[PDB]
Amino acid sequence: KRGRGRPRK
Amino acid sequence: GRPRK
Amino acid sequence: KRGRGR
DNA sequence: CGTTAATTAACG
DNA sequence: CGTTAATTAACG
DNA sequence: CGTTAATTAACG
DNA sequence: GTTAATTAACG
DNA sequence: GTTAATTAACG
DNA sequence: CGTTAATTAACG
Ligand SMILES: [Mg+2]
Ligand SMILES: [Mg+2]
Ligand SMILES: [Mg+2]
Ligand SMILES: [Mg+2]
């Protein structure tokens, strides 16, 4: 169920 | 916390 | 599919 | 008529 | 704590 | 090989 | 709140 | 412009 | 803590 990558640090 | 998918 | 809010 | 390697956001 | 499958990077 | 401004998540 | 890497801005 | 996904809202 | 309302970032 994972979606899009989070914004990077 | 974050919503369950 | 969209991602996180901006 | 793009698959493999690497990454990461899901979970109970 | 830490695997899983989806996503993303890589190659081109 | 352009460089700084602005934004981002992580941390405990 | 602060840090440092990433991303956006600038023209 | 529409749709799926995320985020905000409600008490 | 449940559920729908409202928003917004996907596409091309
Ligand atoms: Mg080759
Ligand atoms: Mg100037
Ligand atoms: Mg397409
Ligand atoms: Mg289409």
Numbering used by the authors:
A (entry chain G): 23 to 31
B (entry chain I): 27 to 31
C (entry chain H): 23 to 28
Quote from the publication.
In the present study, we elucidate the crystal structure of the complex of AT-hook 1 (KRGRGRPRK) with the DNA oligonucleotide d(CGTTAATTAACG)2 at 1.40 Å resolution. Four Mg ions also contribute to stabilize the crystal structure. The terminal bases of the dodecamers do not form Watson-Crick base pairs; instead, the terminal guanines occupy an external position and form N2-N3 hydrogen bonds with the guanines from a neighbour stacked duplex. Peptide G is fully visible in the structure. It has the conformation expected for an AT-hook; its R3-G4 region enters into the minor groove of the AT region of the EF oligonucleotide duplex. Also, the neighbouring K2 and R5 residues interact with EF phosphates and increase the stability of this AT-hook 1. The rest of the peptide extends away and shows ionic interactions with the CD oligonucleotide duplex. In summary, two peptides and two oligonucleotide duplexes present clear AT hooks: peptide G with chains E-F and chains C-D, and peptide H with chains A-B. The other I peptide stabilizes A-B and E-F oligonucleotide duplexes by ionic interactions. In contrast to AT-hook 3 which bends DNA and shows a larger minor groove widening, AT-hook 1 binds neighbouring DNA molecules and displays moderate widening of DNA upon binding.
High mobility group (HMG) proteins are intrinsically disordered nuclear non-histone chromosomal proteins that play an essential role in many biological processes by regulating the expression of numerous genes in eukaryote cells. HMGA proteins contain three DNA binding motifs, the “AT-hooks”, that bind preferentially to AT-rich sequences in the minor groove of B-form DNA. The AT-hook motif is formed by a short stretch of amino acids containing a conserved core sequence, Arg-Gly-Arg-Pro (R-G-R-P), flanked by other positively charged amino acids. HMGA are abundant nonhistone architectural nuclear factors that are involved in the modulation of chromatin structure and gene expression, thus influencing a vast array of biological processes including growth, proliferation, differentiation and death.
